[PDB]
Design a protein around this motif. Structure first.
Motif, short mmCIF file in Angstrom:
data_model
loop_
_atom_site.label_atom_id
_atom_site.label_comp_id
_atom_site.label_asym_id
_atom_site.label_seq_id
_atom_site.Cartn_x
_atom_site.Cartn_y
_atom_site.Cartn_z
N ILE B 89 37.87 39.73 -8.73
CA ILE B 89 37.45 40.89 -10.02
C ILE B 89 36.20 40.17 -10.57
O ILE B 89 35.28 40.74 -10.93
CB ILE B 89 38.70 41.24 -10.60
N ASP B 90 36.60 38.87 -10.84
CA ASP B 90 35.45 38.01 -11.84
C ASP B 90 34.31 37.90 -11.30
O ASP B 90 33.29 37.86 -11.91
CB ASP B 90 36.05 36.71 -12.32
N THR B 92 32.81 40.08 -8.88
CA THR B 92 31.86 41.28 -8.32
C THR B 92 31.99 42.41 -9.20
O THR B 92 32.65 42.52 -10.28
CB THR B 92 32.85 41.71 -7.01
N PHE B 93 31.49 43.41 -8.79
CA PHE B 93 31.63 44.79 -9.57
C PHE B 93 33.19 45.22 -9.64
O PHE B 93 33.40 46.12 -10.13
CB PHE B 93 30.71 45.84 -8.93
N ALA B 94 34.14 44.82 -8.57
CA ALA B 94 35.33 45.26 -8.55
C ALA B 94 36.30 45.11 -10.07
O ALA B 94 35.81 44.07 -10.58
CB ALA B 94 36.11 44.44 -7.45
N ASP B 95 37.17 45.96 -10.23
CA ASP B 95 38.04 45.80 -11.15
C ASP B 95 39.53 45.69 -10.53
O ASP B 95 40.40 45.46 -11.19
CB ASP B 95 37.97 47.07 -12.07
#
Ligand SMILES: *Cc1c(COP(=O)(O)O)cnc(C)c1O
Ligand SMILES: *Cc1c(COP(=O)(O)O)cnc(C)c1O
Ligand SMILES: [Mg+2]
Ligand SMILES: [Mg+2]
Ligand code: NA
Ligand code: NA
Lengths: 401, 400
Positions: B89-90, B92-95
């Protein structure tokens, strides 16, 4: 780096609502959370940890292959995978084996092979798959369409066509759906997720003759019932009915991700170069662990031991039931055991399972009305008794809560 | 008894024809067979072994977690899998993240999500998947139907409907198939199996604009390009185009079976309890190894070291080519590189690969016309040079 149960609700795609406590280590059939609280583990990794947590010989087999090499991909074979394949062949009806990373993968392979076999020998119109209501075969689009919980497929339509579902244990129901256009019948020898329902012996022989008459492949999905679970190495051996294709995963790896398609020569012949594959499947690390699992489970003492542990569980679930009147029946085979709630407690299996966690024992459900036990096949008699004391305490609190 | 290459032909279902020799141990980018013969490995586990063979920190992380517990199944989370989720998460664009065990399971998750998302927000009828010819997205019926090679899907029909294929790098091709009925556009940022062909920047930016106009989810299949392979952590970072969903596997776990779906918060929200699952996905053993792979790979020095290594292979491959006249071009990005065969040697990639292996270097193919290099990201200069010497000697035997 601090890790809390609330981080799960923030970071994970929310397909699971897991326990409020986080395990950090285990040994045999005990497991401990971040605060040091102790649980007897009768959930058994969901019938995966057939030899319990952190087994010393599985760890030694892991480390020994890990220090040579882990993976190359299937352009290169390897010794552990070949030895694993040969163990599986020597122990079962199989002549050849294909390896992959999960039970859904194993089932994809067995359904693909059945489609291709039918198309090559009869024509591409022979595509039908017959499965059973309440079956579970995996989460890939194809395998969740084969399983019989439409709630788990409808959102993802259009589904692969030509699948239909008969009622489990109901031979006429199967007979109505199977014909000369059928390529495969896929069935669990015990419906595990479906409430721990064993197939009857007449039902399975009936699928075997129907598959013979209509030239369809009989597929036993033994991903849950496999690898010692029932008191025999695979359930089909308990039942005396031999499939054409058998899938196996979960306890095959004792916790390491692995699965396999077992096939007769005739069926294997159908899958030529390039028609199927997998990047991780068959790596030597998986294969060295599963190899060790088979060696330790496929022995007379361990398998007889599973029949013995069956009776420990059942005698004591009966006395718990005599005290609290919870269950209309206790069913299953070997160490796949379902406690069926009666009408006064219908749909309360998960609440029972949560109270049980509070009292320090992990159990599963099998649909909302069955409490499921799938402990390690080497669980000790002390671990069975202490876990059932905790289960009995949890039932007492429950019967007022 | 002892294991022989012949046993492979009696015991395995015959989907692969693997090499005549059988590897038994390795270190970094060297590997050795049962007879002690030595290979430089530029196959790199098909772009999986990002840290090489038997990496000592990967081993230590494996053994340390293996002595606590390996697996409970997803009724219980664990610390390794949450730490790994946070690293991803930290970075990439991912949440949010889902974990599974292969790149196909990752692509299943992603395509399922885009289906439900569209269904829940628009209706049952918005189900269309657009993918690209020559794509490869795995071997489950759904993923092999998303794949653009009909030869690997036909035998297993009927195939899931509502899937169509456009020409890769062809914006107007794709525009023709993407409308308000499309739920998802899946695309690899470089086609790996289909010949090591990079997307162009206008092509990806174009897919993103079309996804936005027609409310379809853009899925990047980065199972081959991801985790450092291109010289950025994920190839999307290189291109500057952000997908809604991204899938990752292969090098994720540096050889341990693991995969994951990276999603935005909005997309993750649609997958509620019981709507998807996996028995082994997110186990703490894979999670511990993959956590350590990310820690080691996502550093300025490893990733810049991948740019450097690209130039070592390309410069020396151009020198080999100048000498032997085999290829029309050396392409790719980072350490996913393809040598495209010329007209005279077209369709011969596998014979050059078999010659390579006789000379002690492992290389892959990517279609019968491309020779593919996907070595460990920490391949040493000396390994690149010795392996390329043996590749040169193989090109010489081959050219005659
Ligand atoms: C759990 C299970 C599967 C699917 O296993 P995964 O490893 O989760 O993909 C298939 N069949 C049966 C009978 C199962 O219990
Ligand atoms: C290998 C690969 C997959 C499939 O991954 P598996 O782990 O083999 O199931 C999907 N996408 C791409 C781009 C790949 O290279
Ligand atoms: Mg054919
Ligand atoms: Mg819903
Ligand atoms: Na056999
Ligand atoms: Na982020």
């Amino acid at each position: 780096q601090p890790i809390t149960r609330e981080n799960f609700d923030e970071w994970m795609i929310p397909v699971y609502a897991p326990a409020p406590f986080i395990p950090v280590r285990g040994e045999g059939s005990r497991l401990w959370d971040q605060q040091g609280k102790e649980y007897i583990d009768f959930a058994g990794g969901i019938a995966v940890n057939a030899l319990g947590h952190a087994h010393p010989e599985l760890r030694e087999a892991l480390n020994e292959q890990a220090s040579k090499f882990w993976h190359t991909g299937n352009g290169y074979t390897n010794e552990p995978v070949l030895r694993l394949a040969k163990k599986l062949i020597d122990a079962t009806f199989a002549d050849r084996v294909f390896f992959c990373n999960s039970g859904a993968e194993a089932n994809e392979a067995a359904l693909k092979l059945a489609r291709k076999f039918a198309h090559d020998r009869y024509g591409s119109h022979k595509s039908g798959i017959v499965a059973f209501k309440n079956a579970f075969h995996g989460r890939t689009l194809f395998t969740v369409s084969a399983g019989g919980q439409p709630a788990y497929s409808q959102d993802f339509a259009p589904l692969p066509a030509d699948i239909r579902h008969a009622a489990y244990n109901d031979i006429n129901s199967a007979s109505a759906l199977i014909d000369d256009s059928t390529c495969a019948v896929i069935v669990e020898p015990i419906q595990g997720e479906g409430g721990v329902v064993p197939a009857s012996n007449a039902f399975l022989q009936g699928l075997r003759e129907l598959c013979n008459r209509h030239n369809a492949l009989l597929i036993f999905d033994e991903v849950q019932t496999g690898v010692g679970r029932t008191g025999e190495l695979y359930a089909y051996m308990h039942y005396g009915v031999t499939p054409d294709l058998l899938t196996t995963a979960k306890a095959l790896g004792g916790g390491f991700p692995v699965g396999a398609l077992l096939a007769t020569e005739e069926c294997a012949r159908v899958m030529t170069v390039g028609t199927h594959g997998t990047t991780y499947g068959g790596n030597p690390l998986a294969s060295a662990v599963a190899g060790k699992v088979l060696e330790l489970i496929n022995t007379p003492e361990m398998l007889n031991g599973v029949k013995q542990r069956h009776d420990w569980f059942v005698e004591r679930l009966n006395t718990i039931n005599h005290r609290y009147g919870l269950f209309s029946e206790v069913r299953g085979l070997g160490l796949l055991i379902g406690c069926v709630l009666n009408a006064d407690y219908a749909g309360q299996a998960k609440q029972i399972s949560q109270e049980a966690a509070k009292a320090g024992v992990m159990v599963l459900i099998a649909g909302g009305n069955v409490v499921r036990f799938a402990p390690a096949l080497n669980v000790s008699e002390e671990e069975v008794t202490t876990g059932l004391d905790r289960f009995a305490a949890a039932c007492e609190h429950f019967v007022s809560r």
